[PDB]
Amino acid sequence: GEFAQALKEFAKALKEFAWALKEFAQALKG
Amino acid sequence: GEFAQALKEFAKALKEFAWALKEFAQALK
Amino acid sequence: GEFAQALKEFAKALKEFAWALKEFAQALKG
Amino acid sequence: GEFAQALKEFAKALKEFAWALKEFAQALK
Amino acid sequence: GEFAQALKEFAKALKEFAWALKEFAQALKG
Amino acid sequence: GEFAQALKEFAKALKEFAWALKEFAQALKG
Amino acid sequence: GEFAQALKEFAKALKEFAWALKEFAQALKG
Amino acid sequence: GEFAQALKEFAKALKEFAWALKEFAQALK
């Protein structure tokens, strides 16, 4: 319910964090 | 309930961290 | 229900985080 | 059913994340 | 229940780890 | 039954993973 | 059944990984 | 069936990651 929706919101933010981290890693690779 | 509010707070923080990493990645270009 | 759906979305996001962290490890190494 | 499927996908992601943590730990030294 | 508690604790830890990665990245970029 | 016991053991192991991940996040600071 | 047994096996493995990660983190702290 | 086998394979790999990480920790000291 409220917990499931908040976990979905957390998951989406975590996914976006992952993609930003990968972008940073790739910038470190030039 | 209390767990839902905590998860929302963590999501908020992750959004902020992701923006900073994207700024850092641009700085390395 | 929605809880299982949220757990599946959490799993996908955590998988993306795994790939991102590996990329960062690659960038640190070489 | 869908809950068992979600648990299995979550376990797989936990395993992949643990592998990445192990890889990251190796890279730190 | 305990699984919901565990997901919350793990989400909290992921968030703290994400902060630590962001700080590490900040140092690497100068 | 045995599934509920397995889920409880999984929840407790996930909490241990949470504790370890917070420990690792702190170790990146220093 | 076998799913619950395998989930218990996975939980034990996850606990062992968490302990190893915690040990690494605390060794990194010094 | 397939889910139980998957979980067992993940568990086997997880413990192997743990043993590698334990070795990394010992090398630090």
Author numbering:
A (entry chain G), C (entry chain F), E (entry chain A), F (entry chain B), G (entry chain C): 1 to 30
B (entry chain H), D (entry chain E), H (entry chain D): 1 to 29
What does the paper say about this structure?
CCs are quaternary structures comprising two or more α-helices supercoiled around each other with cyclic (Cn) or dihedral (Dn) symmetry. Here, we describe variants with all combinations of the aliphatic residues, Ile, Leu and Val, at a and d to give four classes of peptide: the ββ class, with a and d = Ile or Val; Lβ, a = Leu and d = Ile or Val; βL, a = Ile or Val and d = Leu; and LL, a = d = Leu. Peptides are named systematically appending the one-letter code for the amino acids at the a and d sites to “CC-Type2-“; e.g., CC-Hept becomes CC-Type2-LI. In summary, solution-phase data and X-ray crystal structures demonstrate conclusively that different classes of Type-2 coiled-coil (CC) peptides—i.e., based on abcdefg repeats with predominantly hydrophobic residues at a, d, e and g—adopt a range of distinct states.
Mutating Ile→Phe to give CC-Type2-LF rendered another collapsed structure, but with eight helices in two 21-symmetric 4-helix bundles interfaced by unusual bifurcated helices. Thus, the bulk of Phe cannot substitute for β-branching at d to maintain open α-helical barrels. Despite the complexity of these Phe-containing structures, they are CCs founded on KIH packing. Moreover, the KIH analysis revealed that helices with the same sequence participate in different quaternary arrangements. Similarly, the sequences with bulky Phe at a or d fit poorly to most structures other than their own.
